[PDB]
Amino acid sequence: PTAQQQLLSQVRLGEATKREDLVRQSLYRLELIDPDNPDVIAARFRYLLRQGDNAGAQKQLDRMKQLAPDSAAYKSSVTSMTLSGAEGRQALQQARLQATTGHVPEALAAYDALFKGNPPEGDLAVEYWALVAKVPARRSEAITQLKALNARNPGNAALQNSLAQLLFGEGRDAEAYAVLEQMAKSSAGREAAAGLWYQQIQRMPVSDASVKALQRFLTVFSSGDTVDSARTQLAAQQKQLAD
């Protein structure tokens, strides 16, 4: 990976862990390396917003507006700026209200009204693109956005889970297998990754390819309890060949 990418990723880590040391450091080197990068400008934009300096924030916003007006970074920053205070804040409060009470189409409608297709960075983007993924039509572009969030903020069990199941739901098994292996190198979700990689084996008829799929599952997962059942039924499956 580049150094900019590592610095920006450290910015996101610092943002996530409420440590503005890291944010400060990474920003400090970033604005010397690539001062006009909309991702860097957006990073400072968010920082200035956290410190309640809406003036400096706004200046950075304008800088982005004259530098990259149709970048995801700019419009996402615009959204965070809308939610920075007052009306937008409560719009969100209402969207999440209908989101939690189970008014899903209403909730999606409100979120569409606020984020207008570019949610503010962080977990809200995950929530939004997951909610949007619930719509059959919009599902595929939303899947694309989710894959992006997976590449930008790695290590999210829940996101990887939803992404894997979505990709299965659209017959994109290779990619879903990939997300399952990514969920397999990290401890948080192995049982889940195994669980999904073992409800795809149940849906294929006992066959040679069934067997090879199950043994491949056996090279990806070592232990667990789906693994034990995988071995048991693997033996049974390959014994069932030749009567």
Residue numbers in the entry: 26 to 268
Paper text:
In this report, we determined the crystal structure of the N-terminal six TPR motifs in BcsC (BcsC-TPR(N6), Asp24–Arg272) from Enterobacter CJF-002. There were five molecules in the asymmetric unit and the Matthew’s coefficient was calculated to be 3.9 Å3 Da−1 with a solvent content of 68.5%26. BcsC-TPR(Asp24–Arg272) is a helical structure formed by 14 α-helices (α1–α14). A comparison of five monomers in the asymmetric unit showed that they can be classified into three different conformations: chains A and C were type 1 (root mean square deviation (r.m.s.d.) was 0.74 Å for 243 Cα atoms), chains B and D were type 2 (r.m.s.d. was 0.38 Å for 204 Cα atoms), and chain E was type 3. The conformations of these three types were different at the turn region between α5 and α6.
BC-producing bacteria have a cellulose synthase operon in their genome. BcsC consists of about 20–30 residues of signal peptides, followed by about 750–900 residues of periplasmic domain of tetratrico peptide repeat (BcsC-TPR), and about 380 residues of the outer membrane domain of the β-barrel (BcsC-C).
